[PDB]
Amino acid sequence: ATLATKKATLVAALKDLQRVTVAFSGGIDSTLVLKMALDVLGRDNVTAVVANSELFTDEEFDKAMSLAEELGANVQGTTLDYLSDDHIKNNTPDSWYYAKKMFYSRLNDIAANNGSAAVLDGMIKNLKARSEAGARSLLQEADFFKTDVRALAQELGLTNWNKVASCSVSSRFPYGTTLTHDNIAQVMAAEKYLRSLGFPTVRVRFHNDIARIELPEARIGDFLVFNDRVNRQLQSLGFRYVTLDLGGFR
């Protein structure tokens, strides 16, 4: 199938729905989904939803919120208490499944109250909780790949999205560590401070009384001028010891 065949299939699917709710993160694929939806159905029939929670930073939320206004869509934020589900709070390998199960549930109730006929995400063809909510991945059921979504992104003149596929803060705690409101706010504030110093790719691992910072090895040399400030700032967030991993990022 050509790029023209699958955009045509994508247009046929959107036209059948008239009114949709789009799960928007700022990503390459969700932006293409949000952009195609507005171009086919219109601004007055597309509702974009961006999720806010403690597991993601508010900087990524505030940014993905405005990327959708830059796309010219009616955007709406919703907040989720992920730690209300213990399966998420206990930080088990399947905690991310229950996060999206709770995420796809909130989208459906919004899809009911706004009058939308389906929930759209930006999942491509190259998972579980995506089906029970009836969420539809239009890009994948039209046989798109990452090479296809990039092609249609240039054709629609889309150049501004996010390259930082942000990760849940739970990856900063070893499996089995109980997440709390305060230790999550402890990690995110330390990562926000380090990012403001000029280090966009950074991890602050949580080791009880120890913070273990992960930087790209080719940036550790540039980090030297900040040792004393990061030490005291992170001590003032609760960490007793502030360290920097010699093994680098991941």
User: Does the footprint of Zn ion cover residue 197 (CB under 5 A)?
Assistant: no
Q: How many angstroms separate the CA atoms of 45 and 48, rounded?
A: 10
Q: How far is the CB of 99 from its own copies (least distance, A)?
A: 25
Out of 1, 4, 8, 167, pick the active-site residue. Answer: 167
Q: Which does 83 bind (CB under 5 to 8 A by kind): Zn ion, its own copies, none?
A: Zn ion
Active site residue 167: yes
Q: Which does 141 bind (CB under 5 to 8 A by kind): its own copies, Zn ion, none?
A: none
Pick one of 11, 83, 151, 158: the residue that binds Zn ion (CB under 5 A).
Answer: 83
Sign of CA dihedral 179, 130, 14, 116: negative
Q: How many angstroms separate the CA atoms of 219 and 147, rounded?
A: 31
Pick one of 50, 71, 111, 202: the residue that binds its own copies (CB under 8 A).
Answer: 71
User: Does the footprint of its own copies cover residue 222 (CB under 8 A)?
Assistant: yes
What does the buried/exposed string (b/e) look like for 194-216 if buried means 16 or more CB atoms within 10 Å of the residue's CB?
A: beeeebeebbbbbeeeebbbbbe
Q: How many angstroms separate the CA atoms of 43 and 68, rounded?
A: 11
Distance of CA 211 to the CA centre of its chain: 24
Q: Which does 58 bind (CB under 5 to 8 A by kind): Zn ion, its own copies, none?
A: Zn ion
Query: What does DSSP say about strands 20-23 and 74-79: parallel, antiparallel, or unpaired?
Result: unpaired
Task: Report the largest interatomic distance among the alpha carbons of the chain, rounded to a whole angstrom.
Answer: 59
Which residues contribute to the site for its own copies (CB under 8 A)?
A: 1-4, 66-67, 69-72, 145, 147-148, 150-151, 153-160, 197-199, 207, 210, 212-213, 216-231, 241-248
Which residues contribute to the site for Zn ion (CB under 5 A)?
A: 54, 58, 62, 81, 83, 209, 222
